[PDB]
């Protein structure tokens, strides 16, 4: 409910509005930390431990769904116990920045980001697998509806609950920003809370990057299997022959998405294009295959192009090859919307600067 109306009922009458607001935000943080711990313990008790002991799936698939749940629990449980220890010494919480730095700064940061990234990075993949399994295996579907019918799931499904770690991590900067707001400035307390908030954003940046690379890798592995580099081993021009063995797995993806290729005299091509670190790859989607085929090269080395926005067309943009060997080739590419063109431009230009 509320800090005011429960703890510190007799002691509220003395404080300022700012010290009340400060006490409320600290209380909400404390209370939602206990509430997160309770969710993690639902995941443990209702899902993970039963899935393990009853052998609902192979240990290897289970390890990819709950890589490190016990360590995730302890990362929050110990922080929670320290919270309880502070609450004991009086209903008005004094300085709190040390408690924050003890979770979000130095070694404590390194640990938390490591553990949160391990838990989340692969999660979207693991949930697709559990969806498939639910659909193909009746004992597993039954187990899932049995488990999800438990009152502690609060009418939510595994895939609703398992995302709470990531959601909890995004709350921390908001909670801190709100504690800072009601802290008297010029204080070390304020300066250290500001540090802790800046460190949380950094942790979130780290987890963001971890999900990103794990998803991107798995995507690229799948594209490689569908990759058809037939028409390129003999080809029509040696501007294309070196990419006969492309292997998308050795590259890092920056971006991807559908583009329309204005190639000829009112003749177009709907492509699926991958912006990699070094290359822009143009592919044709047959339906379940990715075609590397040429006339124009399907692969453009980013170090040897320029990006120009089209004057009259708010959706299109040009990619111009600057290599003296590689004839008067402008690639005209059309994005979905003007916004799509924007982000396609910004990323193409950035990648080109770094190439």
């Amino acid at each position: 409910q509320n800090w005011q109306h429960t703890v510190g009922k007799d002691v509220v009458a003395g404080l300022t509005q700012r010290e009340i607001d400060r006490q409320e935000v600290i209380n909400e943080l404390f209370v939602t930390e206990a509430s997160h711990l309770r969710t993690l313990r639902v995941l443990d008790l209702i899902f993970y431990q039963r899935m393990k002991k009853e052998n609902l799936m192979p240990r290897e698939e289970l390890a990819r769904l709950f890589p490190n749940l016990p360590e995730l629990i302890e990362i929050h449980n110990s922080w929670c116990e320290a919270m309880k220890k502070l609450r004991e010494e009086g209903p008005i919480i004094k300085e709190i920045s040390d408690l924050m730095l003890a979770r979000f700064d130095g070694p404590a940061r390194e640990e938390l980001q490591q553990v949160a990234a391990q838990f989340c990075s692969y999660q979207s993949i693991a949930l697709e697998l559990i969806k498939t399994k639910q659909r193909k295996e009746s004992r597993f579907q039954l187990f899932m509806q049995e488990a999800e019918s438990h009152p502690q799931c609060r009418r939510l499904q595994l895939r609703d609950l398992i995302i709470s770690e990531m959601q909890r991590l995004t709350k921390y900067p908001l909670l801190l920003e709100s504690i800072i707001k009601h802290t008297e400035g010029g204080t070390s307390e304020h300066e250290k809370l500001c540090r802790a908030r800046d460190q949380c954003r950094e942790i979130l940046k780290y987890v963001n990057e971890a999900v990103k690379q794990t998803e991107n890798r798995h995507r690229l592995e799948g594209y490689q299997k569908r990759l058809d580099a037939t028409a390129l081993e003999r080809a029509s021009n040696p501007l294309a022959a070196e990419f006969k063995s492309l292997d998308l797995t050795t590259r890092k993806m920056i971006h991807e998405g559908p583009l329309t290729w204005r190639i000829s005299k009112d003749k177009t091509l709907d492509l699926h294009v991958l912006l990699l670190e070094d290359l822009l790859v143009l592919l044709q989607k047959q339906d379940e295959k990715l075609l590397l085929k040429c006339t124009f090269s399907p692969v453009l080395k980013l170090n040897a192009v320029l990006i120009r926005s089209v004057a009259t067309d708010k959706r299109a943009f040009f990619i111009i090859c600057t290599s003296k060997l590689g004839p008067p080739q402008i690639y005209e590419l059309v994005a979905l919307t003007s916004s799509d063109k924007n982000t396609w431009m910004e990323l193409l230009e950035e990648a080109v600067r770094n190439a």
Partner: protein, 178 residues
């Protein structure tokens, strides 16, 4: 039970969290406005149908481009917000939030909500915008945006007064059932 999933998207401090709190509670947070809204199942009735509507906040996810999509799978309806007191938030609807919602939730109904409608006629608000040659978003502007993004429907509310909050979610639930 008819189970449906709602995800609210939009720029930060355009009051997403606050919108969800008043709906699920039927009351505006009097003494203290919470920062935290946990994943929550609201009971809502429309056209004679009981629906368990799962409410998902994305407050805090605005800067993390690869943490956001995690909330998107299996969504039944998207509540896209802007704030009537920030024409910035509105330009961001076509520029950031609809290409993203259309990419990760193809064919999922979208309702467009202008929050803080109680700020179309705030004098303090009006001045601030007139600085940057702006003004509170007009109903027609929100409705025109709604038509351009192919939204299911356009809605306005004020979390402060509760006005329009109930109808916002009623609309979102009908969209989920479509």
């Amino acid at each position: 039970a008819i189970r449906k999933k709602l995800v609210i998207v939009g720029d930060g401090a355009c009051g997403k969290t606050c919108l969800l709190i008043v709906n699920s509670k039927d009351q505006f947070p009097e003494v203290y406005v919470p920062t935290v809204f946990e994943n929550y199942v609201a009971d809502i009735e429309v056209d004679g149908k009981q629906v368990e509507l799962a409410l998902w906040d994305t407050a805090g996810q605005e800067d993390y481009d690869r943490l956001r999509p995690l909330s998107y799978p299996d969504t039944d309806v998207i509540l896209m917000c802007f704030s009537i007191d920030s024409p910035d938030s509105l330009e961001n609807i076509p520029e950031k939030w609809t290409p993203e919602v259309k990419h990760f939730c193809p064919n999922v109904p979208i309702i467009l909500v202008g929050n803080k409608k109680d700020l179309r006629n705030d004098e303090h608000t009006r001045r601030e915008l007139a600085k940057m040659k702006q003004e509170p978003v007009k109903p027609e502007e929100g409705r025109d945006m709604a038509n351009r993004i192919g939204a299911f429907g356009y809605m306005e509310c004020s979390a402060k007064t509760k006005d329009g909050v109930r109808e916002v979610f009623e609309m979102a639930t009908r969209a989920a059932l479509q």
